[PDB]
């Protein structure tokens, strides 16, 4: 679209938001991380949306850069869908986080928060666990809706790219 | 600046991400909230950065809208500075959160996480508390650096506004 200056800023901002959400989602939280963290999606996917900011400098590289960014957006939207299900229906992919992050949270998990001792269902300890699980669900669904936002804007470009080529 | 199309997108994106960080920071986390939540800064401040997107439609209202958005950016940067100190040096402003948010976290706090029982310093319960405190520090410092990002871009406009007027 002609708004490609206005759109290239949007891609860059979506990149920085992913990087910020990634660093936030990399804050120590226990044994298992979301797949998004261990795939490092917000880092490499974030900077890829910065790099598609190349189109602000309005060659076959750019066709590759835009197409490469579309794969990142799609894969990120899939990864964030997976982690929300990973959190709320079944911890089906037990991504063992990162040991330099587990170092600060070595005895702790958020993929289960039911206490083995039912007296503790009332306990502050249990409310803390469900708080972090709710924050991770929040961060992932925020990352998803911005990952979906990338798909819309990259579609509005690459749909024109290959019809121009 | 002439890039005001590219800049108006940046303002809108900074608005949406403040709203997302606000809703994330409004996820139930205990008795006390950050001041940013109880001031509702990410909601009203976020939509104000959407509204300064009026300059994408390139009158004295716009001079007021830009100047009003600059107050929001400055006040947000101050508020997020305050909450980081509120979390990490002294809980000096005990913003009693919101009762519809406390309903899910009625017995719990993150402005202190030292257990009254020193045996519990090792406990998972204590690691959960410090995890949420670290996440809130993370969310606030992410919100701060984007609140600071607004000041830079609004300065690059209102510095021209009043010299044009």
């Amino acid at each position, epitope marked *: 679209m002609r708004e490609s200056k206005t759109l290239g800023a949007v891609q860059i901002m979506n990149g920085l938001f992913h990087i910020a959400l990634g660093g936030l989602l990399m804050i120590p939280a226990g044994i298992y991380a979301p797949i998004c963290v261990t795939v490092w999606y917000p880092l490499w996917g974030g900077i890829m949306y910065i790099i598609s900011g190349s189109l602000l400098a309005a060659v076959k590289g750019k066709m590759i850069m835009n197409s490469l960014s579309l794969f990142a957006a799609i894969s990120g939207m899939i990864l964030s869908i997976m982690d929300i299900l990973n959190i709320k229906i079944s911890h089906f992919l037990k991504m063992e986080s990162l040991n330099f992050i587990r170092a600060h949270t070595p*005895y702790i*998990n958020i993929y*289960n928060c039911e*206490p*083995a*001792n*039912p*007296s503790e269902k009332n306990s502050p300890s249990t409310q803390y666990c469900y708080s972090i699980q709710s924050l991770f669900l929040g961060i992932l669904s925020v990352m998803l809706i911005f990952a979906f936002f990338q798909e819309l804007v990259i579609a509005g470009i690459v749909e024109n790219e290959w019809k121009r080529t | 600046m002439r890039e005001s199309k590219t800049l108006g997108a940046v303002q809108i994106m900074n608005g949406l991400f403040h709203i997302a960080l606000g809703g994330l920071l409004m996820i139930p986390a205990g008795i006390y909230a950050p001041i940013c939540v109880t001031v509702w800064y990410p909601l009203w401040g976020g939509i104000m950065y959407i509204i300064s997107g009026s300059l994408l439609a390139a009158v004295k209202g716009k001079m007021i809208m830009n100047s009003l958005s600059l107050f929001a950016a400055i006040s947000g940067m101050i508020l997020s500075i305050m909450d980081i100190l509120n979390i990490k040096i002294s809980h000096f402003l005990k913003m009693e959160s919101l009762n519809f948010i406390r309903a899910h976290t009625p017995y719990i706090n993150i402005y202190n996480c030292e257990p009254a029982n020193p*045996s519990e310093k090792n406990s*998972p319960s204590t690691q959960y508390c410090y995890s949420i405190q670290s996440l809130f520090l993370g969310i606030l410092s992410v919100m701060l650096i984007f609140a600071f990002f607004q000041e830079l871009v609004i300065a690059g406009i209102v510095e021209n506004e009043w010299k044009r007027t």
Partner: antibody
Amino acid sequence: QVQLQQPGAECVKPGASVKMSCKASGYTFTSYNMHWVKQTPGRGLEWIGAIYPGNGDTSYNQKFKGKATLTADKSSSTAYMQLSSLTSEDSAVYYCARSTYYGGDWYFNVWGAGTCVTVSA
Amino acid sequence: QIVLSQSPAILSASPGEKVTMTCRASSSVSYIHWFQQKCGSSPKPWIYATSNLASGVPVRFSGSGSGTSYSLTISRVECEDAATYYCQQWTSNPPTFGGGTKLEIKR
């Protein structure tokens, strides 16, 4: 003093169900979690679940969440476990155990003698 | 859900020899508890909170470790020590037991 009494053996039919008791004595029954642990020579010790008799809250191991049904009577001071839909693989020794919080962790500090269950036609 | 791996599965030592048996957790746990079981007995609590001997456990025993690697060690074994020892963790729901180490004594 503190003691958990269990019926020593139950012999039951496939598809049937069995209820086994755990009579607490010598302590405030309602103030502690009562846990149930399966033992089989081929699988070791598997935690089944727990009940807090104070309110009545239960938690279950996911691999047992439809096999066991934990209940407790405040008055007789007795915990119960019902096992549904019994199969050969339910043949085991079942211990009740009382968990205290002690030394900075939960602790199975007293155990029942165990109930031998075998499921056979 | 944490797997506790005990080594060796079978251990033997002559009376007065020193032994160590190890429990390795598939993830780091706050503490490991050890239980002694003899044939036809229920498990007895033996060590709690990684290192505290249960009531009446001989100071002959001690327990140590941290993170993912724990051990129980007996300075000088005796015939009353012949048993199966299970490690156990509370750090995750469900609590889980190790496969046991069977100690038998080379009298």
